[PDB]
Amino acid sequence: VKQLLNQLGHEERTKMEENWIEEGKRGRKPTTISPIKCAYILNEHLTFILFDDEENTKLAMYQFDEGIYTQNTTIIKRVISYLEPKHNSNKADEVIYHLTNMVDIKEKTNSPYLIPVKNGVFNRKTKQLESFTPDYIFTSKIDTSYVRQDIVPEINGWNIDRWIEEIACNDNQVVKLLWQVINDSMNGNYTRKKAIFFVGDGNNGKGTFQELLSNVIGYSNIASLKVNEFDERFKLSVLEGKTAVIGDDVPVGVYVDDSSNFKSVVTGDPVLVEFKNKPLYRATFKCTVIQSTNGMPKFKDKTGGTLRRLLIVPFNANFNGIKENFKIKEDYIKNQQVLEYVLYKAINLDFETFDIPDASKKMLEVFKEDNDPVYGFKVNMFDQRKVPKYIVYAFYKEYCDENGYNALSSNKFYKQFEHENYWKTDAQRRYDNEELARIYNFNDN
């Protein structure tokens, strides 16, 4: 558009000179296009919009070669210079202000069925690639291109699908879940209301998968934030325009005092976000969370909420014992063809919701037992009677041998609420004080 703008500026200056010649030598050779006329020409021959009618909304320009509207001031300034190079910063700002006054108001397309990709928009309803148009209002797009694939790319005899199988210890459910996780991380307007956790005992390829995701998706489109940092002030502000958020390494067994922000982000509920020395507001973040960590973080809520939000991926394979192929994480996942194929395969597959692998359900139960001492006690109870409350207490098996703090006669109510037998009241099996509950009995008669 540089040539077109230079050309239009040339005839505009020529017309101004002709009018000055007709009117006589009085305007001392006017050679600079007035900012209002410059804005008129730009609006006529380019696509400028305004995202919102709110105060100090920055004007957006449609980059034809990129297909996404940009609010970057310097790009617009360069465009002005293309039309009129003699305007300084103040006159270009005046042109921008005039354009802001002229252009119409259009909201960004937040349709979950449309995903911006480098080649163009992708429609999930038709599962088809559509060329970039100014009608589709996007501010960012997936870095990697989208072309039809027929064979699995291989570099130096290394296959991406074989690596995916190797990551999951050759489990169809886990590789399917990983592909679904990639596909969900691609979508920014839809969240699926699940939290993805990667657990790793060592060199399990977790970081390699994180870098693969950060490469297939735009590196700018991804945010970095851990679970324990969600409640911290100004941390949520990084989730503004990011397609997904990745926690690189959550500390092992970290304690989250409050996860209200984390749960709200996971379920897509609106949340209060503030910037540094900026007014507070509320926004809805549909970006998915993907946290890679060793072990498993411990939550404070201890309720069914965090149980329903979370999803765990085993990542059992250990590549530390096998020879480490640094080229996989440094070269192979950065190859254009591999990212292309990954993007194509992930975008084509369709699923309404995450399908939990059988390994994840066992891992979810393990997390439930470890986080909640009461549930772990109930699972490992193996007791036969039911009436004696203090026998049921039994000091809870030395805090389930995991020294997790447990209350008296209050967590008993929590246990009975959590869990056929219900409660029984007998005067011959209770109030005997056989044990003054340290405790070594397991089962009585």
Ligand X SMILES: Nc1ncnc2c1ncn2[C@@H]1O[C@H](COP(=O)(O)OP(=O)(O)NP(=O)(O)O)[C@@H](O)[C@H]1O
207 binds Mg ion (CB under 5 A): yes
Closest CB to a copy of itself among 175 and 273? 273
Task: Please report whether residue 354 would count as binding ligand X according to CB under 6 A.
Answer: no
Binding partner at 328 among a copy of itself, ligand X, Mg ion, none, C-beta below 5 to 8 Å by kind: ligand X
- Distance, CA of 290 to CA of 438 (rounded, Å): 43
3-state SS record for the chain:
CHHHHHHHHHHHHHHHHHHHHHHCCCCCCCCCCCHHHHHHHHHHHCCEEECCCCCCCCEEEECCCCCCEECCHHHHHHHHHHHCCCCCHHHHHHHHHHHHHHCCECCCCCCCCEEEECCCEEECCCCEEECCCCCCCCCCCECCCCCCCCCCCEECCEEHHHHHHHHCCCCHHHHHHHHHHHHHHHCCCCCCCCEEEEECCCCCCHHHHHHHHHHHCCCCCEEECCHHHCCCCCCHHHHCCCCEEEEEEECCCCEECCCHHHHHHHHCCCEEECCCCCCCEEECCCCEEEEEECCCCEECCCCHHHHHHEEEECCCCCCCCCCCCHHHHHHHCCCHHHHHHHHHHHHHCCCCCCCCCHHHHHHHHHHHHHHCHHHHHHHCCCCCCCCCHHHHHCCHHHHHHHHCCCCCCCHHHHHHHHCCCCCCCCCCCCCCCCCCCCCCCCCCC
User: Mask: binding to a copy of itself, 276-315, rule CB under 8 A, as x and -?
Assistant: xxxxxxx-----------xx----xxxxxx-xx-------
User: Taking CB under 5 A as the rule, does residue 268 contact Mg ion?
Assistant: no
Residues 81-120 that bind a copy of itself (CB under 8 A): 81, 85-86, 88-89, 93-94, 97-98, 100-102
Residue 211 binds a copy of itself, judged by CB under 8 A:
yes
Contact mark string toward a copy of itself, 401..440, x via CB under 8 A: xxx---xxxx------x-----------------------
Give the footprint of ligand X on residues 190-209 (CB under 6 A). Answer: 200, 202-208
236-295 residues in contact with ligand X (CB under 6 A) are 248-249, 267, 292, 294
Q: Which does 415 bind (CB under 5 to 8 A by kind): ligand X, Mg ion, a copy of itself, none?
A: none
Report what 420 binds from Mg ion, a copy of itself, ligand X, none; CB cut-off 5-8 Å by kind. none
Q: CB of 152: closest distance to a copy of itself in angstroms?
A: 26
- Verify binding: residue 163, ligand X, rule CB under 6 A: yes
> Is the Cβ of residue 111 or residue 149 nearer to a copy of itself in the bound state?
111
Q: What residues numbered 329-348 form the site for a copy of itself, per CB under 8 A?
A: 329-330
Is 249:293 a contact under the CB 8 Å cutoff? yes
Q: Which of residues 166-205 bind a copy of itself (CB under 8 A)?
A: 201-203
Choices 77-85, 111-119, 253-261, 326-334; region in contact with ligand X by CB under 6 A: 326-334
As measured in angstroms, the least distance from the Cβ of 37 to a copy of itself is 10
Which region among 92-100, 184-192, 203-211, 331-339 touches Mg ion (by CB under 5 A)?
Answer: 203-211
Subset of residues 218 to 257 that bind a copy of itself, contact rule: CB under 8 A: 219-220, 222-226, 229, 234-235, 237-238, 246, 248-252, 254, 257
Residue placing its CB nearer to a copy of itself in the complex, 19 or 133 = 19
Stretch that binds ligand X, among 179-187, 228-236, 238-246, 315-323 (CB under 6 A): 315-323
CB of 235 within 8 A of CB of 225?
A: yes
Comparing CB distances to ligand X, the nearer of 163 and 393 is 163
Tell me how crowded residue 87 is: count the other CB atoms within 10 A of its CB.
20
**Both tokens of residue 157?**
């005899």
**Which residues contribute to the site for ligand X (CB under 6 A)?**
163, 166, 200, 202-208, 248-249, 267, 292, 294, 305, 308, 319, 322-326, 328-329
